[PDB]
Amino acid sequence: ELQTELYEIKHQILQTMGVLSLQGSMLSVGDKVFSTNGQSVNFDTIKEMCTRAGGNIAVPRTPEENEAIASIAKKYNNYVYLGMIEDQTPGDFHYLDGASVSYTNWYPGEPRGQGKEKCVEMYTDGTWNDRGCLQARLAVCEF
Amino acid sequence: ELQTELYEIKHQILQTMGVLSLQGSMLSVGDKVFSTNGQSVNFDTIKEMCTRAGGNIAVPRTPEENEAIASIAKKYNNYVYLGMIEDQTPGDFHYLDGASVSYTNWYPGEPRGQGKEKCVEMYTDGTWNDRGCLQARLAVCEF
Amino acid sequence: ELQTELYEIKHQILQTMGVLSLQGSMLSVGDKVFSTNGQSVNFDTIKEMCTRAGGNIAVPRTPEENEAIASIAKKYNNYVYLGMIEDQTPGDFHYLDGASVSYTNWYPGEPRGQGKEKCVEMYTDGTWNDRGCLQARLAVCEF
Ligand SMILES: [Ca+2]
Ligand SMILES: [Ca+2]
Ligand SMILES: [Ca+2]
């Protein structure tokens, strides 16, 4: 009967996640958890911070996930670098694993950096803009 | 041998709970965890905050649990709305699931709102007072 | 098939640990987690704080663990009491379980308290110094 042990384990996990959620330390959406260290740095620096914590730079794949990151962007009053970069072909973006981006939420007219804006930033309203990768942006990670 | 996997899992849970406890993010009493977002709002707002985090507005059922919530009330220097409301019959209170309240810690003379004070607040010394549900009170949740 | 349940459980644990790590609430090194409440008190007080959180006053047993505690000492700009005390024989130190200390990182010339410095403090560079147990030092716990 590890079930009773499994019940206790599940209970305690919900407790810790409950505490972190209640205190605004993270946002849970489906099986994904978003969180920020509150720091504003560039793309490469964000990537390192997220991977060091055992996670990855956040990327929304659903409207719900997009709205979650947006709320964090809104809360900290800063744009957010997302986990995707531009191919050699302008207008085409891929996740960091190489896969083609599916869900998008570009601000009207974007992307239009003409291949000179490799990264993607999220505005506080949740819409996307392709941008240079060297700006100071809120570090948001997914786990 | 999932036991060794279960040992690692139990260890990591204790670590995270240990960290949260050490930094005062929550209080553990038996199988119950209490926590606050530090905010002072009304009863309905507290209920929503707690349920959104996957928990419930706190309610003590033992002296130990009561003292835990009291310490939080004391720390934040504010009274706490508890998870119970008054029936149609004055003087009789029930938990939010409908069940009759068992453990009580009324301040001497309370409850005496004559049915016009549906909610229950905890003083910083841990004693209870029946009160209106529209005041600004420290949000404390249980998980 | 508790495996799928075990996968979910492992995932959620990594999420919570990821959040705590990302926000600097703790440092993970191997199977050990270090954390501080930011408070500066004496040896006996630290011991109580750590055990109350279900952990123990930190003690490094590897260079990696030592560097982790050092970074915390460096961050909070304060020396750290470590989990060991001196025997009746000067120069010989033991962990709190009684076992003889193995890994050491004494500052050159230390320990030289001549048996009048029972405790051990860590400098911000990570090196050790034997010291009296009544000073105000950063409380760092391991879990
Ligand atoms: Ca653009
Ligand atoms: Ca009253
Ligand atoms: Ca010395």
Cβ-based neighbours of C60, under 8 Å, separated by 6 or more: C66, C68, C69, C82, C103, C105, C122
* Dist. CA B127–CA B21, nearest whole Å: 24
Q: Angle at Cα C99 formed by Cα C93 and Cα C101, nearest 5°?
A: 40
CB contact under 8 A, A19 and B2: no
* Dist. CA A69–CA A52, nearest whole Å: 20
C30 touching chain A per CB within 8 A: no
CB contact under 8 A, B35 and A19: yes
Residue A100's SS3 state is strand
Measure C115 CA to ligand 3 centroid, in angstroms: 10
* Dist. CA A66–CA B129, nearest whole Å: 44
Lookup: tokens for C85: 């005390």
Determination technique for this PDB entry? X-ray
* Dist. CA A2–CA A68, nearest whole Å: 35
Residue A69's SS3 state is helix
Lookup: tokens for B73: 């009330």
* Dist. CA C139–CA B19, nearest whole Å: 13
CA A62 vs. chain centroid, Å, equals 12
Contact present, A76 and A135 (Cβ < 8 Å)? no
Contact present, B76 and B37 (Cβ < 8 Å)? no
CB contact under 8 A, B15 and C143: yes
Measure B81 CA to ligand 3 centroid, in angstroms: 52
The type of residue at B95 is Y
CB contact under 8 A, B14 and C54: yes
Q: From B15, which residue of chain C is nearest by alpha-carbon distance?
A: C143
Contact present, B13 and A12 (Cβ < 8 Å)? yes
Contact present, C107 and C117 (Cβ < 8 Å)? no
Bridging pattern class, strands B27-29 and A93-95: unpaired
B26 touching chain C per CB within 8 A: no
**How many contacts, defined by CB atoms under 8 Å, are there between B and C?**
54
Task: For chain C, state the CA radius of gyration.
Answer: 17
* Dist. CA C37–CA C140, nearest whole Å: 7
- CB half-sphere exposure, B12, CA atoms < 13 A: 25
C19 touching chain B per CB within 8 A: no
Residue B92's SS3 state is coil
Q: Which domain holds residue B138?
A: 1-143
Q: What is the CATH number of the domain that holds B109?
A: 3.10.100.10
- CB half-sphere exposure, B38, CA atoms < 13 A: 4
CB contact under 8 A, B12 and C13: yes
Q: How far is CA B98 from CA B31, B63, B134, in A?
A: 22, 21, 21
Count the domains in chain C: 1
Q: What is the DSSP string of C62-114?
A: SHHHHHHHHHHHHHHTS-EEEEEEE-SSTT-EEETTSPBP-S--BPTT---ST
Lookup: tokens for A11: 């209970």
Q: Where are the beta strands (DSSP E) in chain B?
A: 27-29, 32-41, 56-57, 80-86, 93-95, 119-122, 128-131, 137-142
Contact present, A27 and A34 (Cβ < 8 Å)? yes
* Dist. CA A20–CA A28, nearest whole Å: 10
**CA torsion, ordered B110, B114, B120, B122, to nearest 10 deg:** -30
Nearest residue, CB atoms, C17 vs list B5, B16, B24: B16
Q: How far is CA A98 from CA B36, B142, C141, in A?
A: 42, 43, 41
Residue A47's SS3 state is helix
